[PDB]
């Protein structure tokens, strides 16, 4: 049952991202329960992302060493148990919650690094590429379902701990289903990796694309982590009041926008490829630039009303998510086949480091600084969060400029790569 | 969705220069790797030369090395093969092949099966 | 037991005259019926002309009728095909075929399988 | 059992020619028993040949109409019974013997015209061609065995009637064997035949070849019919005396010379073909010319000794028999495929008419005239027969000239035949 195995793999990825973004779903409840400032709220996700980073390459090496299904199932059980424990951590201990988030990040990195290898080992053809496609679409759906499930459970059970209690049961069930259905598939060096690295740094377009993907990761992390709270605070400032509904709407829009952005990016790059060779990078920049504008407008709109803010969320999320499908093509065309795996690993590390790893904590720090320098009130909390988020569109514009430079150097660096391959 | 048209192939005396031009208008020429393959009237087609989609790398078979030069103008969507020091063994129908861009060594791509596009060959006879 | 050698084939301008000569020395040519069959680069060999062992009867295919003339001299053990008003469709490799004398109509013997002897052939081109 | 059927067909042909030449074997005994002159002795064979003539085309038509095996077996039985009756004809009635010879000729013509059609209908391969070749080789062996068997039986039983009594039993046995083993095989017009004839007469080489084959038939008939009597008479003239042994030796030499002449003619024409296209007719002439000389020398030698005469028989028979295998090739190359059957039939008719039909009776008439004009004695009988036989080599030379003319016109009438085929 290889098809059923890949179906359960996709479900497990959906649940992985669900668990990842559940905390973002119940951000406000956690902050109010622990009495922690915005800095700790961002630190949760920052630690999660850092653990994901430091775990991904090690877990890839482990998968290369030992079997993949065993590691993946062990990971599912591990982070399921960690989240279940997180739902019982005492209120007085917040460092325990941070550590549990880090362990969950380790486990989810194990899954994200092992699942595609299993999918490739099972079929290893066009059918396997199709299995990888739906597996990836599980990502935006996973995040949207995480925000929706967290908000819904927190509101229904009257306790945010239940939002974290629900997921581990599904995690254990999915781990058992994975372990049963997935069939076992079978399919110095440091110096060689250093040579490959040096070659990559010699490339201009690859470095520019890595920096731009880092900017994209920064924006995605900061927004996805702080926007539900921003919407709740905007609703608080306005006379109208419901902040669970705002998170639910944000999750639904996030899922739909992920799907729409992927499809529209694919279509637009397909069309633009017929005009110029350097169309693949260019498109990205364009999109992000638009997104950047919208990613800023929302904030102003967030002070006027929430519906305009949600329309802005829709458009900006679509434009920003259009970039992921094209970044992989840029990397594939820029780097030679021999150095493609090392290039992918280094790009992932750099994108998580320069961006996502330090974005949430930075947003929290800026918001806390603005709050401290000024009078304390819910409106000033909203304004501080708004400024901290407004920091992001500048980074998005910088990433757009990086994609523009990648476009400039794409054709010349595609030439160097092909010349190297021929020789 | 690319059509390949060969032109400029004609008779030339032994040791005389000639140029074979391959044009493609169905799609942009910078998206496909190109090649020239020679077919004898009573023998299967053989590899003459190949060039990448960008034109930085060029490959020639051992027999033709040093006498033929392959150069592609992506802006004009054309590929010109300049043949010099022609010999009777060169007498054949030269067909132009185009293939999807893939990072596969041209020297490895001499099976005349990886190229998914072809054009009516322009014969070149030298005596 | 006969060897066929084809000569006189080369590049000629459109509308020019060209003579293709098939010589045989293995056995007296008067004992064999002869023919010229042209093979295109991408097509199988087709019937061009045929002459009896004595040279009294000659047969030409419809496409070539009125332009090529086949005449054999048994004294030189040779067969000459004179071609006039050459057209681009005439471009091909002309091979000489010889067959054991049999009283079978030449028009019926256009399957290019009854001729048990063959030669390397001489290539011809038009404009 | 098609192969066995063809084997019995070859045996039946051997027996057919055996019965044909048995009379020539016991020529002297018949002449002495009936007290008939040389004219009647030649008339026997003349009537036989005329009946063979008038029967061959009619039997071919009958075979085209009805089944072949039935007609052939009926013929075997018919001529077997006729020969058996011939062995009992009263001495006072010689016309009865002549009529029986005519009927035997009819039956043997039926066989000679039907057997090749059966062989062709059975198979159509190299094995069938080999069967046709073995049937063809039965002819010289048949004649030699006829002369040997007739002489041996006449000498052993002390009566020439036994020479004729022996054959019919074998004829009946072979007829039964044919009827059982041979499987039945299945495989206006006068105006069309007249058109074909007119076309043939328009041809020069065909007419010349027909005349030359007629000369060959004349020589063969006259010699094969009168040479054993000539050898006996030569022995009588000489002091040395044994005329059965002479006929036995003549039959053996005839068989061996038929085989040798066929093979050597085939080889010589094969060689000469490479030199010139007119080789096939030319060869014939050459051979006959040589034969003619020898065919004359024998007679002179026959007056000196019998051993030199037998050497002359050997050489002349070889040279004369070399012509048969090449006459068919000449006819095939001269005539077009459509008119080949009519050409073969007309050539056979002409060769039997202008030659074999009237040769034996003519030799007998000349010998009787020379005897009557001169004093009667065994020596003068020998001299008369010698002169009558000496008439033949002149006809052989004339046939050689006819073959020379055929050689001259072969290329032009071959060119005319191929042009007609193309048009
Ligand atoms: C207004 C914008 C809202 C942003 C919403 C954030 C939730 C959706 C994020 C889904 C996850 C994408 O997060 C990261 O994206 C980068 C960018 O290519 C991918 O690379 C990583 O593999 C993925 O981990
Ligand atoms: C010295 C010469 C002796 C002659 C001997 C005669 C006996 C041998 C004759 C065998 C029969 C050949 O007789 C005839 O030959 C002609 C000549 O082609 C053939 O035709 C006929 O089909 C065959 O009937």
Residue numbers in the entry:
A (entry chain C), D (entry chain A): 100 to 286, 297 to 351, 359 to 539
B (entry chain D), C (entry chain B): 1 to 127
Sentences from the paper on this structure:
Ultimately, after a survey of in-solution covalent bond-forming methods exploring differing natural and unnatural amino acid residues, we found that Cu(II)-catalyzed oxidation at a pivotal C12 residue site (together with the presence of needed Gb ‘gem’ substitutions previously discovered through iterative X-ray-guided engineering) offered a route to direct and rapid, high-yielding formation of disulfide-linked homo Di-Gembody (homoDiGb) without side reactions (for example, off-site oxidation) to form a robust covalent interface. Furthermore, the success of DiGbs for high-resolution structural solution is enabled by their relatively small mass contribution to the imaged complex while increasing the maximum particle diameter for better particle alignment. In summary, our plug-and-play DiGb strategy improves cryo-EM resolvability and resolution of small proteins through constraint and increased particle size with a simple and robust workflow and can even enable simultaneous structure determination of two challenging targets in one dataset.
Notably, the homoDiGb-bound structure of SPNS2 was found in the same inward-facing n-dodecyl-β-D-maltoside (DDM)-bound state as when bound to wild-type nanobody NbD12, indicating minimal perturbation to the structure. The comparison showed clear improvements over the previously published structures of SPNS2 bound to NbD12 (EMD-18668)10 (with better-defined side chains) and, importantly, over structures determined with NabFab (EMD-34104) or DARPin and maltose-binding protein (MBP) fusions (EMD-28650). This increased resolution usefully revealed interactions at the intracellular loops of SPNS2, including the important PtdIns(4,5)P2 pocket (site 2). The side chains of crucial residues also change the DiGb interface. Apart from the triangular cysteine–cysteine interface discussed above, we observed a much narrower interface in the SPNS2:homoDiGb structure. The complex of RECQL5 with an isolated (nondimerized) Gb shows orientational bias, whereas neither RECQL5 or SPNS2 structures with DiGb are noticeably affected by it.
